[PDB]
């Protein structure tokens, strides 16, 4: 049967929780296990109550996702397909009660600090089912880090980073992200001047300019294992398709076009569109510590801007990473 919120959330890690992030799904906190930084994502399941403008999914429902992130947490473990690129995987628990009081009011400071565009999550009742993931602290995400990179160099060495991960995970899971969105990218200081993956078994390096790259969030993701395939069915979705005001909202209209509204097959162009969204971002709405100014950095310039401008010929991020000119 399920827990309760305490076996998860000890009082001393309960008093350390700070909301960091939100969606639809839920909430996001951070706080300290045995003197290790956590992320905690805590989604609503099997109730009738509407949250967050959403009916809450079953466990049938949110089991893809568990499964997902299970699948991209060992990659790091992996010999022929293998990237730390994804985010490692904890814990998953079935929780059962109602929200606790210090979760509330560190909801209310990120709410007065950051505002939210999710319901109080107050009236749950202690008969509530949640399911509480627990992962590895990833860094910062790149929205929030949208004035303090280095450089351009940094940017490619993040599209890189982002391009191999999602090439190691088509080849080894025929993986889908489609929700790679600037918030869904984290960046963690490292001392490595270079990080290492493999792909089908031919290991590369990618500079690092002193920053990991970790994606996250796999509420949309798709994947398949020996002819199985796990997804979030969003085919009867309306909103999805409906934003406007950036790129992003575009990029769900995009995925529906390519995909003719059958998000079960397999179209890693997806990850393309995604990675395309990203250039976007770091070519528009991020400013560097350095700027451009040298000719070293113009000709990285000029290489982000023609992988901006080609990109979207490529099948798969596997195509670009193998292929494009940026990466050699
Ligand atoms: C939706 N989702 C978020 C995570 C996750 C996993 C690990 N970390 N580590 C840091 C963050 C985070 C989230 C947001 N805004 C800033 C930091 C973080 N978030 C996993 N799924
Ligand atoms: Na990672
Ligand atoms: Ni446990």
């Known amino acids: 049967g399920p827990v309760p919120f305490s076996h998860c959330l000890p009082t001393e890690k309960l008093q350390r929780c700070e909301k960091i992030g939100e969606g639809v799904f839920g909430e996001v906190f951070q706080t300290i296990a045995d003197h290790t930084p956590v992320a905690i994502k805590i989604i609503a399941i099997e109730g009738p109550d509407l949250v967050n403008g959403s009916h809450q999914k079953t466990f049938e429902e949110i089991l893809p996702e568990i499964i997902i992130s299970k699948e991209l947490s060992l990659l790091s473990g992996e010999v022929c397909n293998r990237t730390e690129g994804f985010i490692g995987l904890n814990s998953v628990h079935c929780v059962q009660g109602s929200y606790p009081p210090l979760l509330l009011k560190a909801w209310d ?15 749950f009742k202690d008969d509530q089912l949640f399911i509480v993931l627990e992962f ?27 391009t191999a991960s999602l090439a190691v995970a088509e080849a080894s899971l025929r993986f889908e992200h489609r929700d790679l969105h600037w918030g869904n990218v984290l ?3 490292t001392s490595l001047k270079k990080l290492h993956y493999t792909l089908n078994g031919k290991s590369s390096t990618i500079p690092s300019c002193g920053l990991q790259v970790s994606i996250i969030d796999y509420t949309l993701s798709r994947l398949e294992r020996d002819g199985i395939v796990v997804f979030c069915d969003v085919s009867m979705d309306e909103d999805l398709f ?5 790129y992003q909202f575009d990029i769900y209209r995009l995925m529906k076009k390519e995909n003719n509204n059958r998000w079960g097959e397999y ?4 990850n393309v569109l995604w990675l395309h969204y990203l250039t976007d971002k770091m070519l528009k709405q991020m400013t560097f510590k350095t700027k451009c100014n040298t000719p070293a ?5 000029r290489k982000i801007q023609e992988f901006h401008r080609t990109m979207l010929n490529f099948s798969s991020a596997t195509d670009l990473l193998c292929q494009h000119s940026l990466f050699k």
Do not use: V
């Open 187 to 189: 960046l963690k200081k």
């Open 109 to 123: 400071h990120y709410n007065s600090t950051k505002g939210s565009a999710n319901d109080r999550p107050d009236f």
């Open 267 to 270: 179209h890693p162009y997806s």
């Open 136 to 162: 590895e602290f990833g860094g910062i995400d790149l929205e929030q880090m949208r004035t303090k990179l280095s450089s351009l160099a940094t940017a490619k060495s993040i599209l890189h980073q982002l």
């Open 297 to 301: 950095m113009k000709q990285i310039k």
């Open 242 to 246: 409906t934003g406007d005001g950036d």
